[PDB]
């Protein structure tokens, strides 16, 4: 459920964790680039067929 990290240590742990979560997902970007490129190629193939 909901959590309130930092209750005891009164630290910025919560912001820190959010930044970590944002940072790690960076590994996804190359996959997204390749997916988009291949999708564009497929769409171009359809265009040619028309």
């Amino acid at each position: 459920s909901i959590s309130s990290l930092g209750v005891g240590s009164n630290l910025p742990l919560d912001q820190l964790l959010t930044d970590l979560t944002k940072n790690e997902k960076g590994r996804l970007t190359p996959i997204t680039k390749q997916q988009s490129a291949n999708s564009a190629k497929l769409t171009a193939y359809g265009t040619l067929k028309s």
């Binding site: 459920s1 909901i2 959590s3 309130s4 990290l5 209750v7 005891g8």
Partner: protein
């Protein structure tokens, strides 16, 4: 009487009890979970 501070001892024990309770509360609060070890609830973990 010099050789022993009974009041100090009692206060120490009460402080230990209070700190125990505080830790119990804080861990649950932070995790958001009522169960964090086998001690909290025997049947809860199984179910």
């Amino acid at each position: 009487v010099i050789n022993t501070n009974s009041l100090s001892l009692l206060t120490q024990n009460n402080l230990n009890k209070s700190q125990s309770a505080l830790g119990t509360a804080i861990e649950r609060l932070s995790s958001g979970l009522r169960i964090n070890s086998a001690k909290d609830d025997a049947a809860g973990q199984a179910i």
